[PDB]
């Protein structure tokens, strides 16, 4: 598979980069967060536990999928404006 | 949420529209007479009914009480009182005599019945008691006082 | 023992629910699908009923080898060739056939091959007709080794 970062917003008040993915999967599964997670760590050169991936949808079988992630400077700050539900779903803890 | 027409459809164009033959949808006859009609009928009508035990028989036999003659009572199990004891704080607690707690049932005015066990000694005052209720209260180390 | 190949020529239509179901119990549903059955009196019996609906007869080893090869497969696009049989169990396809013929093993034991083979029409068509029995010269019922012909045309 291959992922590109399509559109970029930056909020420096809370010190993150926020990113939109346009995912190309060609006859292969709708991606888990984890498979996006290892590949993303290589592009950013930032730790895996700081990089938090949420919300994904899945189109009609055409081979584009959308999703969002956020890449954080500090690891206190993936828990200030981001609730329980994402984090547990990533598998950061445990 | 289900659109009835969505099911009826313009769809099914059954046009019968979940009724069957066209002849069927009509008057009282499909129903077998109006309402409860036909229960009584000796003749075929409804006999059997859309009741599970079918229809129970007709002749309500037996007699009426005057409303006045019915004292109401209000029954409570010892189980209810016993579980609630800590919640019952408003009602006195006397460790020395009276059992563990002194409860006048009369806060809920009632006849006390025997079901359940009694975890503590209770001194219970009530309008009435069953003999089973007496045995369990005494076994707990409590006492029963009749008002 | 003797092994027979059974093929249903006649469709589900005009069958008794007892015979039609018997055919399903033969592991034969449809037209032109063929099955391997052992000769036991209990086993024999299903075919006896079926007789009017079906063609049966004992096959040659050679003809059996051509049918296992093309037609056979539990699942998957993959054909049952020497190599595939070999991974199953036994040395090769030849041994595997000799063992089936002896009745030493079965297809199931060896798993990943089916008890039903979806066989071909006979080219030159049904061997006599669906109307009548083997004696009468028609396709139905117990046949000789001449079953070889019906199945070869079937592949």
């Amino acid at each position: 598979m291959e992922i590109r970062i399509k559109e970029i917003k930056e909020n420096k008040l809370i010190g993150r980069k926020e990113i939109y993915f346009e995912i190309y999967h060609p006859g292969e599964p709708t991606p888990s967060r984890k498979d996006v997670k290892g590949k993303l760590v290589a592009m950013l050169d930032l730790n895996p536990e700081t990089t938090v991936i949420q919300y994904i949808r899945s189109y009609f079988g055409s081979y584009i999928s959308k999703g969002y992630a956020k890449a954080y400077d500090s690891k206190e700050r993936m828990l200030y404006i981001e609730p329980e539900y994402i984090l547990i779903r990533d598998g950061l803890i445990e | 949420m289900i659109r009835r027409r969505k099911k009826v459809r313009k769809l099914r164009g059954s046009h019968t529209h979940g009724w069957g033959c066209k002849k069927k949808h009509r008057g009282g006859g499909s129903k077998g007479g109006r309402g409860m009609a036909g229960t009584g009928k000796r003749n075929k009508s409804k006999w059997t009914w859309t009741i599970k035990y079918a229809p129970d028989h007709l002749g309500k036999r037996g007699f009426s009480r005057p409303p006045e003659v019915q004292r109401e009572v209000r029954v409570v199990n010892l189980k209810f009182i016993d579980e609630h004891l800590d919640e019952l704080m408003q009602m006195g607690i006397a460790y020395e005599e009276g059992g563990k707690i002194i409860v006048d049932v009369t806060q809920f005015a009632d006849k006390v019945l025997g079901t359940g066990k009694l975890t503590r000694p209770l001194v219970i005052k009530a309008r009435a008691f069953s003999p089973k209720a007496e045995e369990k209260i005494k076994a707990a180390g409590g006492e029963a006082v009749l008002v | 023992m003797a092994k027979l190949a059974v093929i249903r020529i006649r469709g589900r239509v005009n069958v008794k629910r007892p015979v039609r179901d018997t055919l399903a119990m033969l592991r034969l549903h449809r037209v032109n699908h063929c099955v391997i059955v052992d000769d036991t009196p209990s086993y024999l019996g299903m075919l006896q009923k079926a007789k009017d609906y079906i063609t049966w007869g004992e096959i040659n080893a050679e003809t059996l080898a051509k049918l296992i090869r093309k037609r056979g497969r539990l699942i998957g696009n993959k054909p049952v060739t020497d190599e595939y049989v070999k991974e199953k169990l036994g040395m090769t396809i030849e041994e595997f056939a000799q063992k089936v013929v002896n009745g030493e093993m079965s297809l199931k034991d060896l798993p990943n091959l089916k008890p039903v083979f979806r066989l071909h029409p006979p080219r030159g068509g049904f061997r006599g007709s669906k109307k009548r029995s083997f004696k009468e010269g028609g396709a139905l019922g117990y046949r000789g080794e001449k079953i070889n012909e019906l199945i070869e045309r079937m592949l």
Binding site: K6, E7, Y20, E22, P26, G27, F60, G61, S62, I64 | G13, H15 | -
Partner: protein
């Protein structure tokens, strides 16, 4: 590159086409409508419901298209209706093509076409 499997199905769709599945006999009465409109022959009587030959085909699911191919335009691409310049954003020029809505004026349309070609997105109209 784009795929082979997608071509395979696109060719099937061309080749295969579709009958018409405009509602039962339509020529006969002008009442029986206007050039769209299937409704299934609900009648018992029907030869088309009886499915006698020559009485056109009635719809069955069997007739469909491959999912991957359904909804694809005739140059292979994927439609996105585009009302404006903002709608153009996040449109993959390689996969998708834009249709400017009929409603849209020349005044917006000049801005839309010129920006859509810089994004590399094939448009349609003008001017």
């Amino acid at each position: 590159e784009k795929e082979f499997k997608r071509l395979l199905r696109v060719r099937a769709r061309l080749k295969r086409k579709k009958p018409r599945f405009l509602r039962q006999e339509w020529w006969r009465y002008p009442k029986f409508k206007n050039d769209p409109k299937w409704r299934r022959p609900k009648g018992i009587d029907s030869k088309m419901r009886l499915k006698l030959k020559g009485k056109p085909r009635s719809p069955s699911i069997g007739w469909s298209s491959p999912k991957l191919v359904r909804g694809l335009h005739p140059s292979g691409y994927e439609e996105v209706l585009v009302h404006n310049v903002k709608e153009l954003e996040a449109l993959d020029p390689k996969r998708q093509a834009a249709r400017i809505a009929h409603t849209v004026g020349k005044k917006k349309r000049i801005e839309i076409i010129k920006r859509a070609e810089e994004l590399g997105i094939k448009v349609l109209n003008p001017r």
